[PDB]
Design a binder for this molecule. Structure first.
Ligand SMILES: COCC#Cc1cccc([C@@]2(c3ccc(OC(F)F)cc3)N=C(N)N3CC(F)(F)CN=C32)c1
Length: 370
């Protein structure tokens, strides 16, 4: 799938986007690749953070659905009007589909300054689509209207690639390990074990999935439930005891800086998340390096140093395997087989001592879900 390789641009902090065309004549927009939502929602009115927007009046294929949509959430707000129009992905499948579009007229803390994207491609299931499950998501429309296989894959690089309808073997090394999609709403998965520098957190596996565990490209951080987060911070603090950082750094509210090229990657531990396998009590592990959980914050003002933000944060809505976890892994969203595949990416993170990995099988001779 050579033409789809390198079709994504961006970073973990501001999100990965794909170029898409909306309407007829086609209007070009950069769209956020989001596996944690289900609406194809685009800016359709001027905004201080929007460089361009969807102009419905200039589209002869636009159809108004005469239904408003108001989405109030924790991190922000957005409202608009529902409609349908012709949609295509220039560096994706060579197809044109009619898909639902949420025309964003008003928003609060939704769009990001200098993100370079004007909309969101909600790749999750209809159950979480707004205003309700009757609003068919883009991928469902794509699969229904074309002969594109019910599968997509993400290769997020610290740029990247979105392969629609298949797996590109040039984007990964070794074997692909599959975890079952527990329920088709968010991309829900099951964590069976968490290790910090090979040391088990020793918690009932349900704790890692309170109240759910999801794979989300639309979230930066690895988000963990309160109890899991505290024990993880304690284990990372103990492993990196040679240096003491402010409480603010551990809360994700302040930066940690070291002289350019002197980051002590070796003092920080590796994090292993054991995901539920396709067979009973069997599992595989994904290993995360500090290079993934210590997200660099690019700022010309602080450029004499390399400054980092701790990319592990507290969650009250379950575990979120964000962009920092997805980076350096080729993630296969096998919708047709209700499973998520993980393999070491060609753009994986590694130093001379350690490498990010996808390894198994592991046997644990209870149900880890909620
Ligand atoms: C990776 O970071 C870049 C980004 C982003 C971003 C911007 C706006 C909204 C979202 C959204 C989001 C997208 C669409 C939404 O509404 C839908 F109805 F359109 C709501 C939130 N995408 C995800 N995955 N989440 C996680 C959250 F819930 F914690 C907070 N917000 C979101 C992501």
């Amino acid at each position: 799938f050579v033409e789809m390789v390198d079709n994504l641009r961006g970073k973990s902090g501001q999100g990965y986007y794909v170029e898409m065309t909306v309407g007829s004549p086609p209007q070009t927009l950069n769209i956020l690749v989001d596996t944690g939502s289900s609406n194809f929602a685009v800016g359709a009115a001027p905004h201080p953070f929007l460089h361009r927007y969807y102009q419905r009046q200039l589209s002869s294929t636009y159809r108004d659905l005469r239904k408003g949509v108001y989405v109030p959430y924790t991190q922000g707000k957005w409202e608009g009007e529902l409609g349908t129009d012709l949609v295509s992905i220039p560096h994706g499948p060579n197809v044109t589909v009619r898909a639902n579009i949420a025309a964003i007229t008003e928003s609060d803390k939704f769009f990001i300054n200098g993100s370079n994207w004007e909309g969101i491609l909600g790749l999750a299931y209809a159950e979480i689509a707004r205003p309700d499950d009757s609003l068919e998501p883009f991928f469902d429309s794509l699969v229904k209207q074309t002969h594109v296989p019910n599968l997509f894959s993400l290769q997020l690089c610290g740029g990247g690639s979105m392969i629609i309808g298949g797996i590109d073997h040039s984007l990964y090394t070794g074997s692909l390990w599959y975890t079952p999609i527990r329920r088709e709403w968010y991309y829900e998965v099951i964590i069976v074990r968490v290790e910090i520098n090979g040391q088990d957190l020793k918690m009932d596996c349900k704790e890692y999935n309170y109240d759910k565990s999801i794979v989300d490209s639309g979230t930066t951080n690895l988000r963990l439930p309160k109890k899991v987060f505290e024990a993880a911070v304690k284990s990372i603090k103990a492993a990196s005891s040679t240096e003491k950082f402010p409480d603010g750094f551990w809360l994700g509210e302040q930066l940690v800086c070291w002289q350019a090229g002197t980051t002590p990657w070796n003092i920080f531990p590796v994090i292993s998340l054991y995901l539920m396998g396709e067979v009973t009590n069997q599992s595989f592990r994904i290993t995360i390096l500090p290079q993934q959980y210590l997200r660099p914050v690019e700022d010309v003002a602080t450029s004499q140093d390399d400054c980092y933000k701790f990319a592990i944060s507290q969650s009250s809505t379950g575990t979120v395997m964000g962009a920092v976890i997805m980076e350096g892994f080729y993630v296969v969203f096998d919708r047709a087989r209700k499973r998520i595949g993980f393999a070491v990416s060609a753009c994986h993170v590694h130093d001379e001592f350690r490498t990010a990995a996808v390894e198994g099988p592991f046997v644990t001779l209870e149900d880890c879900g909620y």
